[PDB]
């Protein structure tokens, strides 16, 4: 971007909405690429700060949610804290 | 990257797994940033080619799924085909 920003809450209502819209699309674009390159089925659910709902699924949201509910094994499961942990460990 | 690639299925099992791991993390990192910058709650569910499950949620997957079920109003809903269409338009 024209200037580097720190990862922290945006206070200006207007900047927040603008950044939300652009980054949401950027997230969905990256999901699209992953699903095609690597043959994945992906669903994304986003609630904004007012709790409005936006959703993406590579093909069909219902099917992925149904598969999620059926899944029995333990699996990789991450939160913000896992991501932050990974970044403290990475050098790049 | 060193080269532009076409967005099409990677057949080399090894290249696929390397790409999968790096891009999955890239997706979760961008989710993390969006959730903090714009004060929102995000969940991501991924089934790989072997049907193994990977999941991310900014705070709590249960709560997002519970909230999802309670939503009834119409909302933005996109698929790969919408994204492809958008990219046609962007040029």
């Amino acid at each position: 971007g024209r200037k580097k920003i720190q990862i922290q809450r945006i206070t200006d209502e207007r900047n927040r909405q603008v950044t939300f819209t652009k980054r949401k699309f950027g997230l969905m674009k990256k999901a699209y690429e992953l699903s095609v390159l690597c043959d994945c089925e992906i669903a994304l659910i986003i609630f904004n700060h007012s709790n409005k709902l936006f959703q993406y699924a590579s093909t069909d949201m219902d099917k992925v949610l149904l598969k999620y509910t059926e899944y029995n094994e333990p699996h990789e499961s991450r939160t913000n804290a896992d991501i932050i942990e990974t970044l403290r460990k990475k050098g790049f | 990257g060193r080269k532009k690639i076409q967005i099409q299925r990677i057949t080399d099992e090894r290249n696929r797994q390397v790409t999968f791991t790096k891009r999955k993390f890239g997706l979760m990192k961008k989710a993390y940033e969006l959730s903090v910058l714009c004060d929102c709650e995000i969940a991501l569910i991924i089934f790989n080619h072997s049907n193994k499950l990977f999941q991310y949620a900014s705070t709590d997957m249960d709560k997002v799924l519970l909230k999802y079920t309670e939503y009834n109003e119409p909302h933005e809903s996109r698929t790969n085909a919408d994204i492809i269409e958008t990219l046609r338009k962007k040029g």
Binding site: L65, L66, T69, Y71, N72 | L66
Partner: peptide
């Protein structure tokens, strides 16, 4: 995912 009451709530929403 495996078991639960959330699993139940999600399944029903999807099925109705």
């Amino acid at each position: 995912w495996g078991s639960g009451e959330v699993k139940l709530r999600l399944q029903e929403f999807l099925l109705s």
